[PDB]
């Protein structure tokens, strides 16, 4: 099935390259998330202010 | 990976040494449940139930009654998994 | 086969084709473009508006 | 033999025929129980099975033909299909009764449906004005 | 040989992570637990660490790289000429 | 436990288990390679009853009511509904109520 | 399929095809074109039975993503089926899904849809019944019958769609909205979309999408029967709203 | 080989009841720390009434069975690689005579296997002759 | 602690069984047509 | 058409000459190829020989008859294995072939009826001379006497038509119209038995079950279609009387359709499933036909043709099992995917065509017929939906249970798939895909 | 049902993409367990 | 209401199978190296 | 500022998508008229769908030029989007102000 | 060529059009013989009205004329449909621009086509069609416009 | 590599079947492909046009394509042939009746 099958133990400590693969996979997600966040943080907010019906004086 | 007959033996031995309510020293590998282990009416199926969880399959309800020894358990696991060889 | 043997007004039961017109863009040749399908004869031409007789 | 050779006999009407038929089908004298033979019956054919389901039968028993959980010579039920695991049958008693399953479904459906239509009568919205369209003769007034 | 098995001398029901506590919260009932020795290799230190630590490991796997690479990109858009 | 009902079945019914094995493992008729299957009474019984039960059918109240409500009333009611609706629709048509504009299925 | 893994064989042509489709989708978007190529079969009583393929940015993009995911799914299967018999059987079935999906998506005519629709069901049963465990029997057989109910609704819908002189729906919806016939033509289309889209009370078979190999589960949920079901509806906007 | 009788003793009707109960704990409680607690709490419930009259045992089944049936997890922990599993019985293999009907060129890929296959076949014939003296 | 599943066993069972649709679409509709067919052949196809 | 007729007569001697099973086979396919080449017809009668014509309606029917009649010899070879009077078999087939050609080309009603009912004999030879079940006797009694008991009475209607008309060419009847209310039933019902109708389906399952691969293929492949072909030619002048009394026939067909499909679900025999299935499809054909609308009729012609093809192929499948595992039962036959997986492909395909999966000339039918019926009466839809639904339902069951479950324990070694059967299955299906390209010849005949 | 096609198709493909990826994730996990498919059986896989 | 549920059962699964205790047997059947089962995932992952 | 009060006073709350009904009152807002920029002929060739073929279309065709110009990287075409949605946003302000204007003009005569 | 990919799509359009049009000019024009194929002109026939009570050949001639005329008028409905089809495809906003001005031709065509041929079903020959017109003329004269019931 | 056999039925007959199919079909296709390529490229399509008032096409004039030209003139009886066929035959039958 799989070439690594331990017994009553954690995973057989795998190579750094595979560790590097995972960390970068999560890192790319984060990089882009903050990338968008700073580039357009206003989007989560309504892009336009919300004026008030009462505040609108009767001309 | 395949399964090794000696390791099946040591593994049932490991859980048996692990099981408290059995005679702690785990007397002769062929310890009958009602003789020296003293395993009661209900203690017997507690043995089978742990063996189940350990070996990844249910034992049949009556066929547990066929299992009357740790030698039987190895013998039942062996018949399942082609361990004779 | 789509350039020379389309399903025209002569042969029928082949792949008859039909399309919509491109999207103009401000600054384009003939930007304010007029409808080309002048008359209903234009619709369903199938090569018959270009008949030999 | 052929089918006409194997055709089941008429319903047994005295105890000796019951003994014979049970042997004809390899059944024990009490195991054999012919259908009611009331006007749409097979007659001497035994009435077996008809339980909750075939898969209710033993999972691990030594079966000659596991396919249908069947040993060798044994009278196949007249309704083997309609009770086979591939057809209407289960392994364990149901939790509730038929009305429960249908009621729990449909009662909820009717109520939620009707309560929706009541609320469609009051369809909320954002208080905004009607969408303006340029057109001949239309002269909406700018706030100016 | 596929793998290896220890002797089970190591498997002590005295596993520290609140298996003794449930032993106590049983002790008020005071019945027993004969199989509990199995859960020793189960909840063992440095196998999986703390659940909160595991969540830290998971929910934040590359945030540091993300922020660093983020700051580099910030410097690029600041000095490369994009400006604001 | 009936005092050995399970047992009494047990003796004979476990004999033919071995004969099934003998048949299945039979090197000789498997060597003939002509196909076919070890005979099975339940199968033979089942086919014969499946093909023939009219000789058992007694035309009584049960069977009559069963068949009547099985197809007959279905056939009669459905046919009557079809004829009735068509009679109405065609009646409108031959009266000319609906002109050659409203009507549907102009092309079958 | 004699010297190289079938996974390689299909994978490469799949990635090649859909990138071409993707780029053509852009062309359609920058020009906003809609082609409606048509090849007629027969015509009686003034009706024209026609195999039609409509090409628009929507369909092209849709089949594009469907088919990169197809390529990546089969590549994953290259290992998940590492030790299985009938791998080749499994893979050609996957292609039949993809081909049947192409036709169903592009179909702008009710008849062309019907080709792909039961075609999806036709292979849907195959790759659900792939294993030989009784659950797969039950699971696939339920799904196939659920889908068949949908196909029947389309098949009935053909009957009333005859009224408006063709089966090219996207050119009659607007002009004849309110009519009773178009009303119910949407109704039958509505029902068929429910069945493939596993809408309640028909949401009883997507749970039975689980007996198939998780590659199949991926390509049955990613963009498959259910998605094509709603994709029939997006093609039919007018009457629904 | 022996196929067992179906007779059952009240001990078994009560112990296999304990077995199903342990299962029903699993399907309703998962965390092994939580489990062993409640499983041993279950044991006390099977221990406080250890030895009672037969009649009370019958009423004890009259309650015990209902508890399982009325408290059965709607999704029992059906076992992975056993009967009823989520992927068990995935494929089947046909009887060996299918290998017997390979085309001679098809036979020509594993001669060593087929040679030994031929030998074992005759030795099986001897074995079956023994099986009941033919 | 208290397991809310057992707190609302019936509702959870309903909620957990997908509103009992699988029973509806499997047990609640196949019993009759199959009996209907065998009923019918015993009445007309082969009887009356 | 005398070209074909004389070809068949000069093929007859080969039956006597020894070892001509395969030479005859190639010739029958070759003449089918020749008859393919001869194709220019319109609605009018064409190729008017002494009394033989040909037309859209007759041209395709003849091609199917020549097609299927050649495929017999591929299907049946156990006759050669057994040396079970191969000469009588070949002679019986050719005699049947000639009768079909003359039936479908008889421009006179009486000539048509004459060959139509002359075919009673050679088919009966085919079942009886090579049957297997002991039921073969009573089955032959059912087949022959259900037919003759109504097929004879139209003989009066034919002569009555002569007296009031003066001839029996088809165009001549069309000019007139009769409404005496017995002429209608006497002709209609007489054809309905051979159609067959659900209420007189009774014989047909028996005939198929206890008949060889060949006879069953003939029975379901032409005989039912031949009844329908007569209907198409004859209802031209039964219109008014038909209109008054038509709801009964359409009702029983549609009602019987869902019923017989439920019989299929509960049935437990490969030939029984297909036999009942073939009755179901011919139920819908009878419905669209009796609608008499253009869509119904032009579609009926198509569905008869496609149904004949699919029914044949499914019978070859049933023969395959019957010839390996030696038992027709659902129970014995199972899991064949493990023993003939490349064959199970063909099992699926032929099943597919029978449930109207495209590209399939069958499917092309139901669009036409369903449009006709729906237009004729909206009420039909409530049963049309279920009719098709259960149609596909049993076909699913047939395909799955036969090919899917775990194998049967007691099964004695049987040879594997072979070129004859493989080529046989392609030949029945592949034309069933071919025709859609040029349905216009198989789609337009009115 | 409201009648907004663009968001439907936009979300349709979006829905399609990552869920396929999730199906891939599950497939990786399921094989890497002994052919079992229960969330209860699984636990911390991040370390592995 | 369903949107909260989407996050709900999502995180519900997250804790059980993936940050909770490893409700497994004795065999540690877990592997991670397999590149193909990843590399097929990666392209979609990037696009997602 | 919600919609539930409609069910209590189905009169007082104007309703959805409602046209003005007191615009003759010019003593308040709405004394000037609309303004048309993008001619319907150019709009026709613009292929702008009718659902949007409204007063905010001049910028719409402007954007189409932006996107048809530098299509491969639409992200560059940002400011054209920024302005267009703003021009729409101002229309939305008018939409609200129309709603409350007809609300105002309703209220001053309600009890009278 | 403002847009980049459109300035590239043209490049593949030059790629695709290149060899084909070269092939057309290279291995067709130097290898084509000139031949002509015309189009039928079937003479009119004495229709059913003209022919006698029992003139089977004449009646057969009339029906064939009726069938061919049916097949054409059968068609003219289709072409008008195809024509309307193009218009609805013309432009996304352009539906009401020319739907009614163009469709109504198709509408009239259908109703006229129905009146002449519709409601007869298959097997319908010139006789049943012709007399149906006679019946309709009688109805129009007696009971007034069809679509009013009777008086 | 570490191959552990699998019980599999024979694939030979099925594989041979495909091979015969591919073989014979290409056999028939090749001359067919040659013939169609020849006519269309050596001759190609006759062009539609008007009637020369003094002319009268023979029935083979009315098909555009050459392979149709060959088929219709040589192999299929003219429509006008199969027209008079009926007119003759219906004349006798009406008279006889
Ligand atoms: C036609 C034809 O048969 O040509 C040969 C061949 C089919 O035989 P094959 O490809 O060699 O089958 C794989 C192996 O032979 C190995 O085949 P196998 O013995 O492992 O069996 C696999 C399968 C054989 O079929 C397949 O594996 C799928 C290939 C299409 C059939 O047949 C089965 O046993 C499974 C049951 C059949 C399920 C129905 C699948 C077809 C659905 C059609 C949807 C449209 O068809 C082709 O040449 C191209 C097929 C590719 C699909 C294009 C559509 C045609
Ligand atoms: C609402 C839409 C629901 C679609 C399902 C229709 C019911 C038929 C079906 O195929 O559902 C699955 C059903 C049961 O199969 P299953 O329960 O999964 O396993 C066998 C259990 N003994 O499968 C069957 O049992 C086959 C039953 C034959 C089809 C009968 C359909 C009846 C239709 C309504 C009456």
UniProtKB/TrEMBL annotation, chain D:
Subunit structure: Complex I is composed of 45 different subunits.
Included stretch of the parent chain: 31 to 174 of 175
Keyword list, A-Z: Electron transport, Membrane, Mitochondrion, Mitochondrion inner membrane, Respiratory chain, Transit peptide, Transmembrane, Transmembrane helix, Transport
Record family assignment: Belongs to the complex I NDUFB8 subunit family.
Transmembrane segments: 99-119
Compartments in which it is found: Mitochondrion inner membrane
Entry's Gene Ontology BP terms: mitochondrial electron transport, NADH to ubiquinone
Lineage: Eukaryota, Metazoa, Ecdysozoa, Arthropoda, Hexapoda
Domain of life: Eukaryota
Protein name: NADH dehydrogenase [ubiquinone] 1 beta subcomplex subunit 8, mitochondrial
GO cellular component: mitochondrial inner membrane; respiratory chain complex I
Gene behind this protein: ND-ASHI
Organism of provenance: Drosophila melanogaster (Fruit fly)
Membrane topology: Single-pass membrane protein
Function: Accessory subunit of the mitochondrial membrane respiratory chain NADH dehydrogenase (Complex I), that is believed not to be involved in catalysis. Complex I functions in the transfer of electrons from NADH to the respiratory chain. The immediate electron acceptor for the enzyme is believed to be ubiquinone.
Automatic annotation (TrEMBL), chain E:
Localisation per UniProt entry: Mitochondrion inner membrane
Gene Ontology CC entries for this record: mitochondrial inner membrane; respiratory chain complex I
Membrane topology (UniProt): Single-pass membrane protein
Keyword match Electron transport: yes
One Gene Ontology biological process: mitochondrial electron transport, NADH to ubiquinone
Annotated TM spans: 58-80
Major place of residence: mitochondrion
MF-aspect GO terms: oxidoreductase activity
Keywords of this entry: Electron transport, Membrane, Mitochondrion, Mitochondrion inner membrane, Oxidoreductase, Respiratory chain, Transmembrane, Transmembrane helix, Transport
Summary of the function given for this chain in its UniProt record: Accessory subunit of the mitochondrial membrane respiratory chain NADH dehydrogenase (Complex I), that is believed not to be involved in catalysis. Complex I functions in the transfer of electrons from NADH to the respiratory chain. The immediate electron acceptor for the enzyme is believed to be ubiquinone.
Family statement: Belongs to the complex I NDUFB3 subunit family.
Protein name stated in the entry: NADH dehydrogenase [ubiquinone] 1 beta subcomplex subunit 3
Species of origin: Drosophila melanogaster
Source species taxonomy: Eukaryota, Metazoa, Ecdysozoa, Arthropoda, Hexapoda
Gene name of the record: ND-B12
Full-sequence range covered: 7 to 90 of 110
Automatic annotation (TrEMBL), chain I:
Superkingdom, natural source: Eukaryota
Subcellular location per the Swiss-Prot or TrEMBL entry: Mitochondrion inner membrane
Family statement drawn from the similarity comment of this UniProt entry: Belongs to the complex I subunit 5 family.
Record's function text: Core subunit of the mitochondrial membrane respiratory chain NADH dehydrogenase (Complex I) which catalyzes electron transfer from NADH through the respiratory chain, using ubiquinone as an electron acceptor. Essential for the catalytic activity and assembly of complex I.
Protein name: NADH-ubiquinone oxidoreductase chain 5
Source organism: Drosophila melanogaster (Fruit fly)
UniProtKB/TrEMBL annotation, chain N:
Single biological process term from Gene Ontology: mitochondrial electron transport, NADH to ubiquinone
S-S bonds: 51-58, 87-99
Keyword set, alphabetical order: Electron transport, Membrane, Mitochondrion, Mitochondrion inner membrane, Respiratory chain, Transport
Membrane topology label: Peripheral membrane protein
Residues spanning the membrane: none
Subcellular location: Mitochondrion inner membrane
GO cellular component: mitochondrial inner membrane; mitochondrion; respiratory chain complex I
Similarity comment: Belongs to the complex I NDUFB10 subunit family.
Protein's recorded name: NADH dehydrogenase [ubiquinone] 1 beta subcomplex subunit 10
Species of provenance: Drosophila melanogaster (Fruit fly)
The encoding gene: ND-PDSW
